[PDB]
Amino acid sequence: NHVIFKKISRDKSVTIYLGKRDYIDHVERVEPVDGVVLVDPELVKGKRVYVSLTCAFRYGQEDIDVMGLSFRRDLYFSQVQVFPPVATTRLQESLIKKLGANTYPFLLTFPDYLPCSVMLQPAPQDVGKSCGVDFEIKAFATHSTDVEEDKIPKKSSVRLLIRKVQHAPRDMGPQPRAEASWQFFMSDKPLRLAVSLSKEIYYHGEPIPVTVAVTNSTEKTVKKIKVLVEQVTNVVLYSSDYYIKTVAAEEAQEKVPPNSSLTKTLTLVPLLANNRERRGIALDGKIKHEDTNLASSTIIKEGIDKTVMGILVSYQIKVKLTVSGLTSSEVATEVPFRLMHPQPEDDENFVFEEFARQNLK
Template sequence: MVVNFKVFKKLSPNSKITLYMGKREFIDSISVVEPIDGIVILDPEYIKQNRKVFAQLICNFRYGREEDEVMGISFQKELTLVSQQVYPPLKCEVKKTRMQEKLLDKMGENAFPFVMEMPSNSPASVVLAQKAADDTPPCGVQYFVKVFSGETEIDRSHRRSTVTLAIRKVQYAPTKQGIQPCTIVRKDFLLSPGELELEVTLDKQLYYHGDKIAVNICVRNNSNKVVKKVKAMVQQGVDVVLFQNGQFRNTIAAYETSEGCPIQPGSALQKIMYLVPNMAANANRSGIAVEGDVKKKELGLASTTLLASQESRDAFGIIVSYAVKVKLFLGALGGELCAELPFILMHPKPQRKSIEEDEKPSKIVDV
């Protein structure tokens, strides 16, 4: 079988260093993350001068707006997660991927491979959406592969001899569904007999982006109050771990109805409400957690963040969760009754074609 695969290419401003990478998205399987591999092509002048060249994995975490940075205060942390000397090559053997072997055969003796292991507990690539007219750097977590020439790995790199390529750490949906979400909440009233019962069930726990969420609602009114209307919402929870009070919620889909209402004392109502959370309905809203290509504005709702344990929460990260919330309105004196069910919203894992089967030249994409 013959398979074509893309290779991403980026040059330094002085055209002395060229970076090639086979992919820009690396899958986090909770316990392990795909290794970050690539090829660096050096100009013969750099090789003659025996210049040192380093490759680094950079995590950039911005937790405040750039326009609010005054008097030297910065709302940004730049962490070097991995650093590796690419040239002169170190004695340790680099276990090359099939893509690297093919590029090394094609590019010749001025090509040098690198492989970096991303820490498994590092945060996912998530940023907070901004309004369309806002061109400042967004708050959130972004990753970059940086290749530069310098005396040491902590040397301040010069822009002309530096290549920086944005990459993403992503998670995909589990292969199996979890337990079907279901909850029952009840409310009694002071000086009034009986109680109001609300049962909410989702058709499944795991949804893919774009799926329709079926919310099965059952109301049993054994009180003397009247239910006037029902509202169902999908809420996105955002937890900026760095801050103690950095948790907030956004309603990204909602449906309110009075159909079947009022629900009189002693009666019941059973109905299904459908919700579809998507980016199109929240296109120009700020503060929503999104993922995708920020520069090209190719954004979608961020996926649920899966953690191996609560102890693995990285301080420089954003944790995203989703929940369906159903609310019954009883009027000014009766108040409200709410039920909430968490669920998982993610992309299915793509089927990547094996590069080992490739015999044709790769398609090179300039970045």
């Protein structure tokens, strides 16, 4: 029972139908956008209907008694003609049959140099403004005087805010543990801290087994071991904004006394759910929407300037050790890992629905 998403123009001349709201990027390639446009042939007589896929980075928010700063960079734009009619998919053939002979198909493909859906609304403490990477499917009708005069009337247009969602690639090699070790000499006795994860890539919702191995050869005591999942966000267009936020924390009060060692495996799950405060964090949608999660790890492709990603999202495990004196010292170290959605898979009946996403409040 396939749920199809429809939206209709104001003047009811153009209606657009999509198979999905969210389109999978599995690194190797990206799911193309196959849909259909249903035209009212009376209202489109001597007109031309096109469909456009735009990816755009945006920056800046409305502010009272504060100067309005706005910025947009288009990162990809591609347009095709649906009407008049000039391979197909099963989804289209089926939707055409169901909807009539006024239904016309469109296929818009993503390239490999784009980021995935990333958004950020800042907290009061944060410097820097609202920014994000949107993806817009837009169907719209033009006259033959609308071409060559650059006119696209609003009532004849219909836009949809789809998501490019980051999934792990289908064939992956076996994953080496994400492991590092440090040696903090204190009076020329070493305090050795090793940190190790099971794998390099974790899935949203999947728990992360963090193995910590303190080897205290010092005369000092490790009073406290804290383990975090930090999300590091770097806005890399317009404004060099930097956010780092804990999205998961576990704090054992294990003591490692002088001339002893303690191995230990904490399990963290970095979730948007864990954060009442959803601001200052890179999400893959709006705070209000239900289907919105933490943004996946940015995957910069070989020889692609990172700045064309707009927002850079990375995750890391941070281990903090509190260490006694004879006040006290605190050392900390980071271990990077990638967080994305699980790898993808290998008549029909249609229930039609408004594209508008489900809120939580």
